[PDB]
Design a protein around this ligand. Structure first.
Ligand SMILES: O=C(Nc1noc2c1CCCC2)[C@@H]1Cc2ccccc21
Ligand code: NI
Length: 308
């Protein structure tokens, strides 16, 4: 009944945002392990759910083009383009950050030449939290599958485009219920299903629901990180993910065995005393010390560069 818009097909439905490709490369951001809800349904055209609406995004060298599927079919409003502005955190100059990091790190300088426009998305805490609980012992394709199925089974239907049905992220009450783990195991999550249901239940009962996640957004990083590590299936790595990508702590540097490999190979880093909680914490401090208060954003450039 309706298709994904392209820029040639429906140009009166697309608004634009002035935005160079050195501030943003959609293809290095949207499927690079931050959000798992964006898919290149047409060449250079990216579709996904933001906040109970669907968007398609594409860009020139100078412009970022946006169309929104909500209702009388319009182009994006001013309020809706503001939410994309915030989502991409576009008030922060990535050009100036790239330079700032480059001046202390020769290796970064080399990689950055090739991989411009990698930035950090500003995600909803709830979507971010349950996405990263699903990320243990997993890959980007399977996580994308688990998150899609989870939204289909538990969150409200928004719209269909071609043969793709889009659902909003579920609320906590919907993932907390007595049959949720069992349903989630049927959807392929394995053990991760226990953690999803258990963490939803814990945010409601032990922390007072989603206002908690907003409190953590305003709390200091270290306070947020500790509070997150109390949740089932959430340890240091996942907590740093959420901190970096959804709670406005740009200094958070997620460290797993993969980042360890890269630090060692490309920086010559060794713990000053193989991986452990102590050593991984030391490596996050190392990078914070080197790159400064946006160390997690610098990690993202290298992270995407490593996925290639
Ligand atoms: O870990 C992931 N993403 C990230 N972890 O730290 C960072 C990111 C992306 C942004 C900057 C810092 C996801 C989960 C998984 C599994 C296989 C491959 C990628 C990924
Ligand atoms: Ni060595």
């Amino acid at each position: 009944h309706m298709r994904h818009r392209t820029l040639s097909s429906s140009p009166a439905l697309w608004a634009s945002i002035p935005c160079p490709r050195s501030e943003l490369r959609l293809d290095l951001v949207l499927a690079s392990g931050q959000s798992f809800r964006w898919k290149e349904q047409s060449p250079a055209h990216w579709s996904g759910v933001l906040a109970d609406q669907v968007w398609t995004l594409t860009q020139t060298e100078d412009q970022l083009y946006c169309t929104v599927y909500r209702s009388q079919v319009s182009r994006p409003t001013l309020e809706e383009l503001e939410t994309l502005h915030k989502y991409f955190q576009l008030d922060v100059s990535l050009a100036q950050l790239y330079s700032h990091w480059a001046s202390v790190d020769s290796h970064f300088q080399r990689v950055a030449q090739k991989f411009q426009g990698v930035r950090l998305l500003r995600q909803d805490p709830t979507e971010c939290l349950f996405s990263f609980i699903c990320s243990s012992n997993n890959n980007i394709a399977r996580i994308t599958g688990m998150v899609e199925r989870l939204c289909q089974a538990f969150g409200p239907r928004l719209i269909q485009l071609d043969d793709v049905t889009y659902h909003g992220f579920p609320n906590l009450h919907a993932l907390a219920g007595p049959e949720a783990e069992t349903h989630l195991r049927k959807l392929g999550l394995g053990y991760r299903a226990r953690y999803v249901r258990a963490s939803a239940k814990a945010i409601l009962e032990e922390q007072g629901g989603p206002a908690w996640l907003q409190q953590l957004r305003v709390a200091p990083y270290e306070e947020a990180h500790k509070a997150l590590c109390t949740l089932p299936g959430v340890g240091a790595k996942v907590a740093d993910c959420i901190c970096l990508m959804a709670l406005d702590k740009p200094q958070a540097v997620p460290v797993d065995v993969h980042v360890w490999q890269i630090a060692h190979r490309d920086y010559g880093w060794h713990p000053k005393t193989g991986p452990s909680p102590l050593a991984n914490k030391e490596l996050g401090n190392f990078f914070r010390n080197l790159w400064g208060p946006y160390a997690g954003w610098a990690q993202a450039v290298l992270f995407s560069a490593d996925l290639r």
